Amino acid sequence: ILGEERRSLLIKWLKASDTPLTGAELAKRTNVSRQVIVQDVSLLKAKNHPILATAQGYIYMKEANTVQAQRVVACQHGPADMKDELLTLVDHGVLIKDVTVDHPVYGDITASLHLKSRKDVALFCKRMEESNGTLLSTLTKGVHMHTLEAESEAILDEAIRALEEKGYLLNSF
Ligand SMILES: [Zn+2]
């Protein structure tokens, strides 16, 4: 019952929140470890709760106030340009919803980044440099996809235009 009561609290907190809630925050609210929160959210996902784990924490998926434009963007940059590419997008008010790499073993690998702010980008680059961080490894030579979303198609156009200026787009060939 304690597990069921804890998971009931998680649902309530995720639905009330407008920002991602880290596993560490949820763990401290319920006096468990962050590994236990991983298991709780896994059980809730299997009961068809649209809960998403992002680089900044968990979100309960719900629809927005206004229709947000979306676009799939093919990108490619050097092994040390990732922070600059991500900062370029968030500075245009674009949500970096995910990244996808065409892996030769796993197939398409997609990570739900949900980067929105400069601090999101900085902390994500900080923690991934402090580990192996080879999702964008030597395998695809920098080639990767992004799902971007913004308030309008004109904002996406300008953000993508800024990527091309910096040479971060995959160019037709
Ligand atoms: Zn990228």
Numbering used by the authors: 7 to 179
What text does the study give?
The crystal structures of the niacin-responsive repressor, BhNiaR, which negatively regulates the expression of genes involved in the NAD+ synthesis pathway, were determined to be the apo and niacin-bound forms. BhNiaR formed a dimer between the C-terminal domains as well as between the N-terminal domain of one subunit and the C-terminal domain of the other subunit, whereas TmNiaR formed a dimer through the C-terminal domains alone.
The apo crystal structure of BhNiaR was refined to 2.0 Å resolution with crystallographic Rwork and Rfree values of 20.18% and 22.78%, respectively. The zinc ion is located between layered α-helices and a β-sheet of the C-terminal domain. It seems that both the apo and niacin-bound BhNiaR structures display non-DNA bound conformations because of the crystal packing and interactions between the N- and C-terminal domains of each subunit in the dimer.
